[PDB]
Amino acid sequence: TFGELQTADDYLHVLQLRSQNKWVKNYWNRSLQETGKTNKAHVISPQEQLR
């Protein structure tokens, strides 16, 4: 078996694909749902219109 890095990369893209899928699903669910805020979160400070 000749292990030139292009042929090895062709071998290893499947395993990398599965590992990336697992990592990205965990990232999306846990990290984004637990940390990020959607739809332009901001802090609102009201002021009454004075006389």
């Binding site: 802090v43 609102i44 400070s45 009201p46 002021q47 009454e48 004075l50 006389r51």
Partner: protein, 109 residues
């Protein structure tokens, strides 16, 4: 704290009242909310910085429309009565100086 601060602290409080914005400071004292938005520090600061001119307008409105009060008029003319009240005496002496013998006791006309 038992013998001096009870007397020194009121003077410092008076100094701060003359120096620090009293309405804004009193607004900042009540920190918290009871079911309404806009009672946090940021909103209170914003309304307080807009409340200076509103308070000026309210004082002028009270002076113009409501029945006048002696304290309001005195504070409106405080410099004529408190600090430069002696300038009134100076002007009176100057007006009466022509017949007042002050030219014969160490003074000019």
């Amino acid at each position: 704290a038992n013998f001096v601060i009870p007397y020194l602290k009121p003077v410092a409080d008076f100094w701060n009242s003359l120096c620090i914005d009293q309405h804004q400071d009193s607004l900042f004292q009540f920190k918290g909310q009871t079911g309404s938005l806009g009672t946090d520090w940021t909103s209170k600061y914003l309304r307080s910085e807009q409340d200076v001119y509103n308070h000026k307008y309210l004082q002028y409105h009270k002076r113009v429309h409501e029945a006048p009060e002696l304290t309001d008029v005195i504070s409106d003319n405080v410099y004529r009565l408190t600090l430069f009240a002696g300038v009134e005496r100076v002007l009176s002496v100057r007006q009466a100086q022509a017949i007042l013998k002050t030219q014969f006791a160490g003074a000019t006309e």
